Amino acid sequence: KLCLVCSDEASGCHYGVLTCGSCKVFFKRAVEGQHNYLCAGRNDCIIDKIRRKNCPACRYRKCLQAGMNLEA
Amino acid sequence: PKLCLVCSDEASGCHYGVLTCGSCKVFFKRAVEGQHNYLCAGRNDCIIDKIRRKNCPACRYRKCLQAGMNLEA
DNA sequence: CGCCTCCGGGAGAGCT
């Protein structure tokens, strides 16, 4: 019942991966159109409920790493 | 207490443009997509309510259409 | 028919 991107409470399988609603819509938005997203740390930011908003680059990386994809 | 505009049963929200109950939503989608041709056994003016709605899909469909229901809404 | 679960996705409200 835990999101594989941020460990918040998961709402189901979204875009192929067990995720929360937050990460589901974050990903849909990130994966379409152009976004810079630059990490301010060392591309290993902590992405949990409290901090996931801080680094969209690291959050997006984790989405991809977990296997999220539009085709699913 | 929100009432389906087609059959007066308890509405479940705004479906296809119109405040309807779940059964009317489901019925409407099926009616439009099976291109169903229904025939009224009366005078094209049946009472459509929770029990009677089953009797006359012709009149139920007509009412759905007259209320503004549309799949693209 | 009337209902169910599951998931995509728009609206919009509220941040920053």
Added chain:
DNA sequence: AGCTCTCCCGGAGGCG
């Protein structure tokens, strides 16, 4: 503005 994230409602696939 851009972004976040929950309220609704859509289809698909299924069941009694």
